[PDB]
Amino acid sequence: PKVPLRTMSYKLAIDMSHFIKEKGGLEGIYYSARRHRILDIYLEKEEGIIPDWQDYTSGPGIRYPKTFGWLWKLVPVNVSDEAQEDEEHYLMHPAQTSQWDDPWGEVLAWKFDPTLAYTYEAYVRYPEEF
Amino acid sequence: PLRTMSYKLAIDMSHFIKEKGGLEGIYYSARRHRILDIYLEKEEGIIPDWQDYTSGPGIRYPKTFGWLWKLVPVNVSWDDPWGEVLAWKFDPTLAYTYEAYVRYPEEF
């Protein structure tokens, strides 16, 4: 039936990290609050993961996942050339995020990082965010 | 991972694009043609050998069976060798009729 709820432990975070990768992964997909909550619902629905686990550090640059074992961090994506990323947008995806949705103005995309299983960067670098 | 544009892929990419703002009603140009080429080469690794449209005056039909987009003239009363403004129009019946090959097999 429905998977019983369970919190994302360290081992579960790794297994879910690879489960999402095997499902195609999130590489290079642009981050967003809506995509964030969609990811949350996907793991509750298919795997019963209580969705109190997906959070990222806030400083500029890499946004490290605050649950240790989650291997999908956020990275800033480089400036889009004036020509022709705006014509590309009109042509294909006319509905764009505003970069100032992020407090640092940075456009964020998911990136996979296996080393995040061996260093809890979020807590090692920014303990004050806990 | 370059992959070539199959029928099922053309259907899906047709739908993905149409789902979003997509190409609907947008003025066609040789520039915008290549931009679409790149955006698909990059975002899905599709060799850009698929997006051709039949030549003559009138509606231009896509030469990849499964690509659900054609080019339609806009009434008004230039880039086009026939003297027409062209616009992208989604058309789901191209899933079931290879109009390009039916009407103009010459171009194959």
Numbering used by the authors:
A (entry chain B): 104 to 233
B (entry chain A): 107 to 183, 203 to 233
From the article:
The Nef protein of human (HIV) and simian (SIV) immunodeficiency viruses is an important replication and pathogenicity factor. Nef-mediated internalization of CD4 from the surface of infected cells is highly conserved among primate lentiviruses and thought to promote the release of fully infectious viral particles and to prevent superinfection. Nef stimulates clathrin-mediated endocytosis of CD3, CD4 and other cellular receptors by acting as an adapter of the adapter protein machinery. Our study thus provides insights into the molecular basis for the versatility of Nef as an adapter protein for the internalization of surface molecules containing endocytic sorting motifs.
We were able to improve the crystal structure to 2.50 Å resolution by using an N-terminally truncated SIVmac239 Nef starting at M87 before the extended acidic cluster in SIV Nef. As before, a synthetic peptide of 16 residues comprising the cytoplasmic dileucine motif of CD4 was added to the crystallization screens. Again, the sorting motif of one Nef molecule in the asymmetric units contacts the hydrophobic crevice of another Nef molecule. In this structure, the electron density map was visible for all residues in the dileucine-based sorting motif, providing detailed molecular insights into the interaction of Nef with endocytic sorting motifs. Additional density of a helical conformation is visible in a solvent channel between both Nef subunits. This sequence could not be unambiguously assigned as only the main chain of two helical turns is defined. Upon binding to the hydrophobic crevice, the ExxxLM sorting motif of SIVmac239 Nef forms a regular α-helix (αL) of two turns ranging from E188 to M195, thereby ending with the last canonical residue of the internalization motif. The negatively charged hydroxyl side chain group of E190 aligns between the two positively charged guanidinium ion groups of arginines 137 and 138, forming two strong salt bridges in the assembly between the sorting motif and its recognition domain. L194 binds central to the hydrophobic crevice with contacts formed to G128, L129, I132 and R138 of Nef. Of note, no water molecules were seen in the binding interface between Nef and the sorting motif, indicating that the side chains of L194 and M195 sufficiently fill the hydrophobic crevice.
